[PDB]
Design a protein around this ligand. Sequence first.
Ligand SMILES: Nc1ncnc2c1ncn2[C@@H]1O[C@H](COP(=O)(O)OP(=O)(O)O)[C@@H](O)[C@H]1O
Ligand SMILES: Nc1ncnc2c1ncn2[C@@H]1O[C@H](COP(=O)(O)OP(=O)(O)O)[C@@H](O)[C@H]1O
Ligand SMILES: [Mg+2]
Ligand SMILES: [Mg+2]
Ligand SMILES: [Mg+2]
Ligand SMILES: [Mg+2]
Lengths: 465, 465
Amino acid sequence: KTVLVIADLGGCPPHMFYKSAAEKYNLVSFIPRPFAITASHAALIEKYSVAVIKDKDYFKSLADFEHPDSIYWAHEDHNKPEEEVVEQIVKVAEMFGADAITTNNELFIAPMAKACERLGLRGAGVQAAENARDKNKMRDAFNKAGVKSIKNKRVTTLEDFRAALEEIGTPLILKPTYLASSIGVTLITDTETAEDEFNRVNDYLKSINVPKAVTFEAPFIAEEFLQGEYGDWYQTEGYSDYISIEGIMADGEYFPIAIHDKTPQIGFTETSHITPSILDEEAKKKIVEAAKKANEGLGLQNCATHTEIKLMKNREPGLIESAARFAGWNMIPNIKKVFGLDMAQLLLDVLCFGKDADLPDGLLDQEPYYVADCHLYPQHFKQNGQIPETAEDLVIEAIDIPDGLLKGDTEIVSFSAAAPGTSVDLTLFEAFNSIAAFELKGSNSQDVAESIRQIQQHAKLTAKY
Amino acid sequence: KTVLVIADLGGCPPHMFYKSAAEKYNLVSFIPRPFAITASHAALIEKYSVAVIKDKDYFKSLADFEHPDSIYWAHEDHNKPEEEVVEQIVKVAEMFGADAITTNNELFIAPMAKACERLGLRGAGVQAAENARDKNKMRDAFNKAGVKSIKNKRVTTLEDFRAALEEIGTPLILKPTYLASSIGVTLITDTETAEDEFNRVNDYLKSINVPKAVTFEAPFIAEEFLQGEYGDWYQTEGYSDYISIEGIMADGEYFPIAIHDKTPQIGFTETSHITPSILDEEAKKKIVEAAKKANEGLGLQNCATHTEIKLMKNREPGLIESAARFAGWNMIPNIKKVFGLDMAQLLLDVLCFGKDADLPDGLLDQEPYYVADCHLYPQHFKQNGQIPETAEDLVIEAIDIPDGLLKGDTEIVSFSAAAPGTSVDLTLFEAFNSIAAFELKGSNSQDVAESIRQIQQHAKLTAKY
Ligand SMILES: Nc1ncnc2c1ncn2[C@@H]1O[C@H](COP(=O)(O)OP(=O)(O)O)[C@@H](O)[C@H]1O
Ligand SMILES: Nc1ncnc2c1ncn2[C@@H]1O[C@H](COP(=O)(O)OP(=O)(O)O)[C@@H](O)[C@H]1O
Ligand SMILES: [Mg+2]
Ligand SMILES: [Mg+2]
Ligand SMILES: [Mg+2]
Ligand SMILES: [Mg+2]
């Protein structure tokens, strides 16, 4: 079978996805945004694809041919309307006799579903992909699905925002409807300053570059803040009052795979993911039921899902959002590390063979140990005081982890820092700015989690200011 | 315009060809032999092609995806008949709306010409490409063309060889009809040992891996040795009694570009190429006339040509062979370095626009200096005595050029050696075995040539035996 991948940023990381897919399938890669592709990613695409096509419109001089080492967000214009992007995807699938189409990138999810319908291939479903990609549509589907409902309003104007804040009250979440990675996600607690907070992220949002293929009913959604009740869920310290759960939709039925515990965010910037959750079986049953109702509520047919859930009072699961694609960072690789299951291969098996794929009957269990996937940010060193608080730029020499910081049998499997010499702008939104990553493993989850907090508070930044 | 390149070994090197082509054209690359592609070559193909297709039949496990750092000859099977290879090329050109097809590899020249005819694109010409690829057909075309003629016979059997040696006498050249790089090329001078010499290279030839797409009337050609008369041509020492000349056929007319001087071969293994020739204008007029008659005699329509010519008594040019593709090593890059002319771009301009291309009217001149492209071989150190004569293997630590060795204003532009640690088998045919490469430049050609001989005799090999 031949699988077409729409290659771009995010989701199951290139270091796993290409090799995984090429094991069992003939992979063809379509690159709609050549500029979104790093040098490492380009190498992996080249290595494992039997065929590769790039959008030739995004090559005007010989330097369009350059691949950066690192990309946190694609800044260049992509100006094709969604119908045109659909027609491209279709043309490429047809060129290669594709039996399935997949993507790891949030921004191409809606057009891909349209391409699959037109080709008679398995996909998210046209309206379902739109629901999984416009947070106002999504929140409407959730409210209808008999998970916990909350108040939410479409916001374009200061007038819209004013109305929303009056109707919803504080605390209020205001966020863009069409992005990812917590971009623009703001917590409103003060009616005195709320309107300035809006004006500010409004102006910010307009500086974010997205393809014209991305459309939305209103730029913002304002909705109730879902309050966490940590102590109603976790028995030990170390985690946060949200989780994610990774699943697969197959013919419109939800198949849970694994739940990830989290460490506390820096604002809304995510910090760490632990595979699998320490939560008891009843807690996990409730999360699974919520994710099922949410994703079936969206109408999704065949895709991976990454579903985020706030752990609220009375063990009520609150839906934050759900995507029709893989979790990012190393969450999917780490499921393979722990359980032996390759969810990338499993998705492709579903796209090609439906419920003939070997879907697990329930969450994976009998984990031999826990694995943490962790990023450090300028803020861990601002909060450490190693970076002076008022600094807009810095130059990175080294990042070191002092010894002694590990609890129990917790092991550091790997550690990677930003190269000596690297330049960091501190006006930047944090989630774009991890300057180190580490993987921990341990037999005891609470020990793993404590070690993450120790590594976080004590890591050593040597840096020219 | 869209150019399809059949990507494989030899010709205009990847470090020039892809970037050159992608400057002015939309490049699509077809890889019929994934195993023939080095890691550097793969990277260049990926960087400059808007689309890439590989033959998926040559991928059975995840390690078919590996690219070696270095390949001297493709060892793996390629089992498709020529008609099947033609049909592939056609299918790919049709997929991408190719306006032209080119290749740098000798072994795909015949099928490509067939694909171009069928598609109505410019090419070598079907029978002309066959003549440029079967040395018995080639030598027959040459004899007909009114360049100097010589005796030649088709050899398959010991009986055939015996007959050929009687009819031709010594000295005799016996060589495979369908290869390159002097593989199997043998000089016969002794009727006592001639039949054993045949039996030996017969058995050797059968161990050389070529695609099934390569066919030939007889495996061997035996033909008169063309005697050189150096002193009838060159006024100074430093060169050899053969040259090459690089040209372009456009609509069946020959356009000379540049003549390369050579340093003496190690047997028939080539050693160095100097851009451009020091030969006087009359000598160059005779070479050009010979190359014209030869390549027009072959019937070639639209292609690059690399034509090798023995400098014989009475300034008679002897045809050695001619290919319907670029010279290998850095001969084509070095023409650009000296004259500013990019022959890769010029070939593509001819394939797409015919004689509307900006073809020079005669050999390029007003060279600002001479550039030498030079390889060192185990033999330069065997002959130096730095490698003991009876050694079948070695391990390379370093290769050094002592200072003092440069004549006049000759400069070393660049120097590259085999990595410390590299392993070298000395049973191997020499042309496969360069362990260092250097580029010289100088204002005075005879000084450049002398410096090459000094570097050759005195270079320092540090090596574990
Ligand atoms: N209604 C909400 N209540 C509480 N937290 C929220 C809410 N909406 C978003 N968040 C927080 O902001 C983060 C990012 O918002 P999310 O809706 O997941 O958008 P994104 O697609 O940018 O990741 C979430 O992981 C969650 O911590
Ligand atoms: N008839 C010949 N007379 C003299 N030298 C020859 C003859 N044939 C081949 N050679 C020598 O052998 C080398 C390689 O042979 P050639 O015919 O060019 O085949 P290849 O395609 O292997 O390079 C030539 O560069 C030339 O030096
Ligand atoms: Mg999201
Ligand atoms: Mg999210
Ligand atoms: Mg040859
Ligand atoms: Mg030759």
